[PDB]
Design an enzyme around this catalytic site. Structure first.
Site, PDB file in Angstrom:
ATOM      1  N   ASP A   1      -7.221  -0.707  -5.390  1.00 20.04           N
ATOM      2  CA  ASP A   1      -8.661  -0.709  -5.161  1.00 20.04           C
ATOM      3  C   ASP A   1      -9.133  -0.172  -3.960  1.00 20.04           C
ATOM      4  O   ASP A   1     -10.156  -0.350  -3.681  1.00 20.04           O
ATOM      5  CB  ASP A   1      -9.050  -2.029  -5.627  1.00 20.04           C
TER       6      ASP A   1
ATOM      7  N   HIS B   1     -10.818  -6.826  -4.302  1.00 21.43           N
ATOM      8  CA  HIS B   1     -10.435  -6.670  -2.956  1.00 21.43           C
ATOM      9  C   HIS B   1     -11.662  -7.740  -2.283  1.00 21.43           C
ATOM     10  O   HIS B   1     -11.873  -7.643  -1.105  1.00 21.43           O
ATOM     11  CB  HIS B   1     -10.730  -5.288  -2.108  1.00 21.43           C
TER      12      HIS B   1
ATOM     13  N   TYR C   1       1.041  -1.027  -0.150  1.00 21.89           N
ATOM     14  CA  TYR C   1       0.078  -0.131  -0.081  1.00 21.89           C
ATOM     15  C   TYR C   1       1.024   1.244   0.121  1.00 21.89           C
ATOM     16  O   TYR C   1       1.976   1.132   0.935  1.00 21.89           O
ATOM     17  CB  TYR C   1      -0.784   0.041   1.119  1.00 21.89           C
TER      18      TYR C   1
HETATM   19  C1  LIG Z   1      -9.641 -10.029   6.147  1.00 20.68           C
HETATM   20  C2  LIG Z   1      -9.304  -9.651   4.703  1.00 20.68           C
HETATM   21  C3  LIG Z   1      -7.980  -8.885   4.744  1.00 20.68           C
HETATM   22  C4  LIG Z   1      -7.739  -8.443   3.535  1.00 20.68           C
HETATM   23  N1  LIG Z   1      -6.339  -7.606   3.482  1.00 20.68           N
HETATM   24  C5  LIG Z   1      -5.744  -7.267   2.223  1.00 20.68           C
HETATM   25  C6  LIG Z   1      -4.440  -6.155   2.305  1.00 20.68           C
HETATM   26  O1  LIG Z   1      -4.059  -5.839   3.407  1.00 20.68           O
HETATM   27  N2  LIG Z   1      -4.119  -6.164   1.134  1.00 20.68           N
HETATM   28  C7  LIG Z   1      -4.461  -6.675  -0.334  1.00 20.68           C
HETATM   29  O2  LIG Z   1      -3.837  -6.163  -1.304  1.00 20.68           O
HETATM   30  N3  LIG Z   1      -5.646  -7.445  -0.153  1.00 20.68           N
HETATM   31  C8  LIG Z   1      -6.345  -7.675   0.878  1.00 20.68           C
HETATM   32  N4  LIG Z   1      -7.496  -8.438   0.967  1.00 20.68           N
HETATM   33  C9  LIG Z   1      -7.921  -8.963  -0.307  1.00 20.68           C
HETATM   34  C10 LIG Z   1      -7.170 -10.329  -0.929  1.00 20.68           C
HETATM   35  O3  LIG Z   1      -6.026 -10.330  -1.176  1.00 20.68           O
HETATM   36  C11 LIG Z   1      -8.227 -10.982  -2.165  1.00 20.68           C
HETATM   37  O4  LIG Z   1      -8.099  -9.842  -2.840  1.00 20.68           O
HETATM   38  C12 LIG Z   1      -9.493 -11.667  -1.661  1.00 20.68           C
HETATM   39  O5  LIG Z   1      -9.391 -12.070  -0.298  1.00 20.68           O
HETATM   40  C13 LIG Z   1     -10.055 -12.490  -2.662  1.00 20.68           C
HETATM   41  O6  LIG Z   1     -11.348 -12.769  -2.384  1.00 20.68           O
HETATM   42  P1  LIG Z   1     -11.839 -14.263  -1.657  1.00 20.68           P
HETATM   43  O7  LIG Z   1     -11.600 -13.896  -0.126  1.00 20.68           O
HETATM   44  O8  LIG Z   1     -13.168 -14.420  -1.986  1.00 20.68           O
HETATM   45  O9  LIG Z   1     -10.878 -15.359  -2.256  1.00 20.68           O
HETATM   46  C14 LIG Z   1      -8.339  -8.688   2.263  1.00 20.68           C
HETATM   47  C15 LIG Z   1      -9.291  -9.761   2.359  1.00 20.68           C
HETATM   48  C16 LIG Z   1      -9.736 -10.275   3.409  1.00 20.68           C
HETATM   49  C17 LIG Z   1     -10.922 -11.220   3.339  1.00 20.68           C
END
Ligand SMILES: Cc1cc2nc3c(=O)[nH]c(=O)nc-3n(C[C@H](O)[C@H](O)[C@H](O)COP(=O)(O)O)c2cc1C
Ligand SMILES: Cc1cc2nc3c(=O)[nH]c(=O)nc-3n(C[C@H](O)[C@H](O)[C@H](O)COP(=O)(O)O)c2cc1C
Ligand SMILES: Cc1cc2nc3c(=O)[nH]c(=O)nc-3n(C[C@H](O)[C@H](O)[C@H](O)COP(=O)(O)O)c2cc1C
Ligand SMILES: Cc1cc2nc3c(=O)[nH]c(=O)nc-3n(C[C@H](O)[C@H](O)[C@H](O)COP(=O)(O)O)c2cc1C
Lengths: 393, 392, 392, 393
Positions: free
Chosen positions: B183, B254, B155
């Site tokens: 995003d 995301h 980030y």
């Molecule tokens: C609890 C949680 C925290 C997340 N934190 C980040 C983050 O810090 N940075 C990022 O690029 N994506 C983050 N994501 C998104 C994931 O990298 C990914 O895009 C997403 O979980 C894919 O969806 P799915 O959970 O249905 O497989 C997060 C998702 C969840 C569920």
């Protein structure tokens, strides 16, 4: 496995089974079966691969098709007989191969579906599984009518000698055709089944050779005089390949949704395939069968109108056999037979040959949808209309 | 927050967790997690933005695609290994970045997903979040295999010095790539999260809402690590990424945690690859997708449409929370087998053979919204009934 | 059959029937009927063939059509009268033939629907079934107004003499038309009906399964009454009817009681009228539709697509069963008002002005079947919740 | 009517109303309202015509539209202000006219939505109903800010003198525009409402003249200097007619589904209309507003991207006013404001002018479906997959 309370309950329900002629449709046998079979049997019989999407889709796709019936047609007489793989048959349907029938019918197994297919006035082809509980000879010997036909479903063994001999054997025994299954080179994950056994290449078994290829089929064609049908085709390209190597037919199937999940409904593959066979100048070179999710006579009629030579049913017969045995199978046969005749009359045709596509409305065959997810808050808070109520007592 | 009854119940359920090898699919970890995590952790992990439409749609869109499997093909041997961002990987999937893993796993956090990704025979790429509970050092140090690869999700901070330094640091530590998330210039509204805690507020100086393409172009000069733009949601931006020369993008929203009504990445992927070809940009970029992937067949579909790799967030989070490192390893095994098993039934033997002719895409666009239910008509209607057992 | 508990309960519910003018819509008569009729009557009246797909589809297809209403139009006055089979009628709808009305109304049967159709200010055409409980004579004699018209629905008997005589008889009695039913050469399987009673059997010598077009051509010569072919389900047969010169057809599938998966008549109507024009057969035939019509707007849509009249079966049956002749009159009033009220909001003032430009037909073809539900994904998912009141 | 147990229960729930800033979205006010309002009020406010299909469709059609957001865009600053009917407004939305506000708020009625629209930092236009509980002057006098604007919604009376005078009056009082409603020449049948009053030309009332025509609007245009907007247009042909007679705008609306059932979602009519206005060389000659089923900021953004000048909301504000009064309305305004700003940021634009159609995915705008009815037997008997379970305690 099966507990005492399980056993006690089911035994009591089995004595409360309703009289066989109170059974109105194929779903009735399924309900009764779901309440009386052992956990293991029910799980084995009713399961599909993974999320079981294809298993249900096989049936639902029939509903994307509607009828355009003819009226003011003399329908006093109707004929649903036809011909399959060279033999004349009383009906346009058949019993597809189902391994381990003794799970639901411990004493008779497959011998009972055989008696069921020949003991009544309507003789129905029976496809015999390689993985059957009973032996080939006893299944074939149990056939009560010389007029009834039986087909042998084959899995090619890693040890080809075993297969070559089995073929010589079933051919000597008198089966009218060989259906070689090609949609199970590896075992599908039936999870309801797996959960019970808590009471990667692990899905492969040399018993069913994962290396079977077209070449292998070409050679099998030389080692036998029995018509060969490739069971388990799921795309048009392979129907064309089958036609080109000269086998007698194919059954558009996905193993009742027990193998690859998200394989298409065979009825849809059928709709796409027959016109292409004509374009490729292969019309009638192959006999095309379909199976999966067929539960009503109108399901069968739709398949026939799209060009199927015959329609197979697995589970419905399995459930009938398990709950009522040979007589159940006969009943099932009678129910399907009548649904087909009665709806053929309303369709306005009098023979299987007259079942053509102009009788179907195919305009929405492709409306296989996935809705946008539910706005739960909006719908939860919403309060719909209510019906008037009776006066306060 | 977490009450005594809550704690008492969950502690008891945790001792009744079933044996790890009784876990059949990814949904099982989700169910167990939903009953054992703290309200806060569950809400944090399971929520999506606003009505959570996209969160669910990400998954459901995979069901608008069907297979056209090949039969009579020698599928005795199968290979699901591939290459991502210059590294050879045993599988076509990876663990996407998930901040605050210690919420579900207080003792090990992200260190446990790292051990999970490399402790078994299948080494899976792990993307490390900027907002992770553990430090970069300790998460990378926890990796048990030298063959396993790790990616750093970044980030960009309003304070670019902090970012420039963090990059030098993770690069020194050995991460194979930088995934910069675009995003989340602002935090999405996860309402399940908000209820528990009972518009310039959605902006934190931690994630700079002023990030632009120029910024990425400059980042490209300050590092030798491949750069991937994580969070692309339209074809125009995939093309811009290819034009500024980054290494790839991950078609993502995301996990439905940001803009509600962003489309299913799988759909955006289907539209994008053919356009990249038309624009003479074929293979200039490596395209990844994430969101709602839960079954091996979901992965196969993404691969057939041209995805270089498929990421999963929540599933791994849930496994890690309930079973720790071994859970992550288990999840990895489950997905691995689902992919191999269905690749065989698909009739192909390697990732390279997964092409679009294997898919039926004719109904990819059937994303519908039904006319509202005629409640009176349906309420009054009485459907058919099944036969019944005799009266005892 | 009907038990003592059954009888005791229903008799008590019948005394709690709400006052007739508290009945707001046609569904209200259906709900009351469903709780008061005998198992046999309810099953007989409410059932459809096999899975009852068409029965429901007949109604639902109306919802694939939307309105494009005109505003700023003087709608102070409105006229819903029209002409059918040569007679002027106060409304654009009618009571379709329903055999065995005494099942729901033991004392009056069809005589009560006749009184209902003419006892009020709105005289509605009544189609009398061949299989009615009452005799033709008594049903026609029961008509209270000389201005009300009655039609005779005919089933051709294997014994043509019986039919020829019945025709001379109803013609002498004064019916204005003959509707010969052709969708029941064989009896459909109403399973709800069958369960209670616990393929050449579906053929009765009463309804001759050998009826053909020639037969209709000859019937045309033996009578002066207009002839309408009731039960047409495809465009080819509407064209054949027009070519042999009968007066009209009713696009119908017997209220879904015959062939399951026959299409919604409204859909067949939409496809048919334009084709009649192309074939230079515009207005040669009068086209009626029935099946699942329950609201005035259903009727308006049929009329905008070119229907001369719209028939209703079950709704009137239920009204007659629960409230007798007055119920039928009430139903008539309800439908009458729904039509006038919505015609005003539609922005037209007479039946003649109801044309297709008033309808949005762009989604008429969106008759769908969804991909099966991903049960594990949906079961495990937890949707958003509404805020709650403070703890008491 | 309202019983003692009704009254007792609701009074107690009203004291358990949660703190206003614990309200997260518009649906929350709806839930609370549905539990606290009198039967009569709830019925009056929440009902739609007949089967209420259009009422729900107004909202669901927004879901046939998806976003194609821009990323890597500087979105630190965002501006959701715009202009409507000649006045600058802080937000792209407004409170549409809702008759009898005293039903839910007995003491303040409309005066409270007026204070709610001007008491905070965000001043929101308020459309005042002709059938309001309060009088025009008291509603206008209750406005706390001179910067806030109010519009008068007019029903033309059979007695035109009354209307001519009312117009002179509201114009003297300072309303910025006249919205004349044309979708209610006759009263729609709201059945939830009708059931309570049990505790053909009868739908007409000389109070609202069913004979209003375009000519009448043309003349009204001459009798006043206030911009005129025709509220209740439901087809493209009438938007074009409005543009041709020169009024200032129209509001694509169906009275919140309270009039003709099966009228289309205004968002869909909007999508069809703006392109046609351009083709007819009428671009910008009219200001086009939409209302109905708008409940989320993204609903508003979609409307704006398709060319709406402003988006109106009825019921949500009514519920906020009824449960929390003026402060509730202010809260509602804050919630909508923030949803719009936050999603605009994620959309990748920084001002209302930048909200254009290329930001929307309109490819499935027409997927308004009606599924084939459910195969109840097949689905009833079917048994779906189950999740793993915890060990037996
Ligand atoms: C609890 C949680 C925290 C997340 N934190 C980040 C983050 O810090 N940075 C990022 O690029 N994506 C983050 N994501 C998104 C994931 O990298 C990914 O895009 C997403 O979980 C894919 O969806 P799915 O959970 O249905 O497989 C997060 C998702 C969840 C569920
Ligand atoms: C319990 C069960 C066992 C089966 N065993 C075999 C088998 O050994 N060989 C084979 O070719 N097909 C087998 N099939 C598939 C059937 O031949 C057929 O494709 C399927 O049952 C048709 O689907 P349906 O059950 O929905 O009618 C089996 C199906 C079931 C339900
Ligand atoms: C109980 C019942 C009996 C019927 N009997 C006849 C009949 O004897 N002759 C005929 O032409 N149609 C008959 N019909 C069909 C109706 O004339 C009409 O086509 C149908 O009821 C329209 O469907 P609806 O009930 O949904 O409005 C009957 C329908 C029902 C429900
Ligand atoms: C209880 C209620 C009363 C209404 N009264 C009027 C009115 O007097 N005049 C008018 O032009 N619109 C009236 N409307 C319609 C609104 O101005 C607006 O079209 C509608 O509320 C928008 O739909 P929504 O409630 O779903 O947001 C009313 C709506 C409701 C719910």
């Amino acid at each position: 496995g099966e507990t005492k309370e399980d056993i006690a309950r089911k035994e009591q329900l089995k004595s409360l089974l309703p009289p066989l002629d109170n059974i109105i449709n194929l779903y009735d046998f399924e309900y009764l079966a779901s309440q009386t079979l052992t956990k293991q049997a029910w799980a084995y019989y009713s399961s599909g691969a993974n999320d079981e999407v294809t298993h249900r889709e096989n049936h639902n796709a029939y509903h994307r098709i509607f009828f355009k019936p003819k009226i003011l047609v003399d329908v006093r007489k109707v004929d649903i007989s036809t011909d399959m793989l060279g033999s004349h048959v009383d009906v346009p349907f058949y019993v597809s191969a189902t391994a381990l029938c003794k799970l639901g019918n411990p004493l008779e197994g497959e011998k009972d579906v055989a008696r069921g297919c020949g003991q009544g006035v309507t003789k129905v082809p029976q496809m015999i599984s390689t993985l059957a509980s009973c032996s080939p000879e006893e299944i074939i010997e149990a056939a009560p009518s010389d007029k009834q036909i039986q087909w042998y479903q084959l899995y090619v063994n890693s040890d080809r000698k075993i297969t070559d001999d089995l073929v010589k054997n079933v051919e000597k025994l008198g089966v009218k055709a060989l259906f070689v299954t090609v949609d199970a080179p590896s075992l599908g994950q039936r999870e309801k089944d797996m959960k019970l056994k808590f009471s990667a290449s692990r899905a492969l078994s040399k018993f069913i050779d994962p290396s079977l290829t077209w070449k292998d089929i070409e050679e099998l064609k030389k080692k036998t005089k029995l018509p060969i049908v490739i069971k388990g085709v799921q795309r048009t390209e392979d129907v064309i390949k089958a036609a080109e190597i000269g086998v007698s037919g194919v059954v558009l199937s996905n193993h009742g949704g027990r193998q690859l999940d998200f394989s298409r409904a065979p009825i849809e593959v059928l709709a796409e395939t027959m016109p292409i066979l004509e374009q490729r100048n292969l019309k009638d070179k192959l006999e095309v069968f379909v199976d999966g999710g067929v539960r009503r006579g109108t399901d069968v009629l739709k398949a026939l109108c799209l060009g199927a030579k015959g329609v197979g049913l697995g589970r419905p017969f399995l459930y009938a056999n398990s709950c009522y045995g040979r007589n159940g199978v006969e009943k099932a046969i009678e129910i399907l037979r009548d649904e087909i005749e009665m709806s053929m009359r309303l369709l306005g045709v009098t023979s299987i040959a007259e079942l053509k596509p102009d009788l179907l409305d195919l305009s929405t065959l492709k409306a296989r949808t996935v809705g946008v997810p539910n706005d739960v808050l909006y719908n939860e808070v919403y309060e719909g209309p209510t019906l008037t109520e009776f006066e306060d007592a």
